[PDB]
Amino acid sequence: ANPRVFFDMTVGGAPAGRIVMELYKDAVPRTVENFRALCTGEKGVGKSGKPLHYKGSAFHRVIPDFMCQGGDFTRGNGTGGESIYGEKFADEKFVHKHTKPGILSMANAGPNTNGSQFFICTVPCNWLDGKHVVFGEVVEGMDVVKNIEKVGSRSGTCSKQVVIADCGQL
């Protein structure tokens, strides 16, 4: 089966609901395995000395009519993050494109720099195709996504903090 993982989100400390994501283990298993493990925290601590775990991390960059970005559990601002394999890992395959809201894809700093940061598209983003590895999609709680999207701004700054209060695997 393709794994399903979840985030229980808060916005300004207030519960916002659950996002459930299906991960395309069938297509991009190495990328999926990283994300799945970062939802459970099972692999221990990274090079940063922080837990390899999304729990407690935030969506630090949210841009309406584009995407929600999170996963920087080491610096909280887009300058950190790391994978269960080490700081960075290769782009596995570009077999899926950024075709619809709810697509889940890896943020990076150029080719072969995947860590832990990810984004959820809120529009089709074809200009990202070939540059970011798509590895899953939101299957429930897209409303929670759209509610987070509204707290964002053009600068990416959020009006209230958007936190993955809890996370794990179903």
Binding site: I63, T79, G81, N108, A109, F119, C125, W127, L128
Partner: peptide, 11 residues
Amino acid sequence: XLLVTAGLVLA
């Protein structure tokens, strides 16, 4: 522009 980078956010 509209990118998703991790440390130097560009146009």
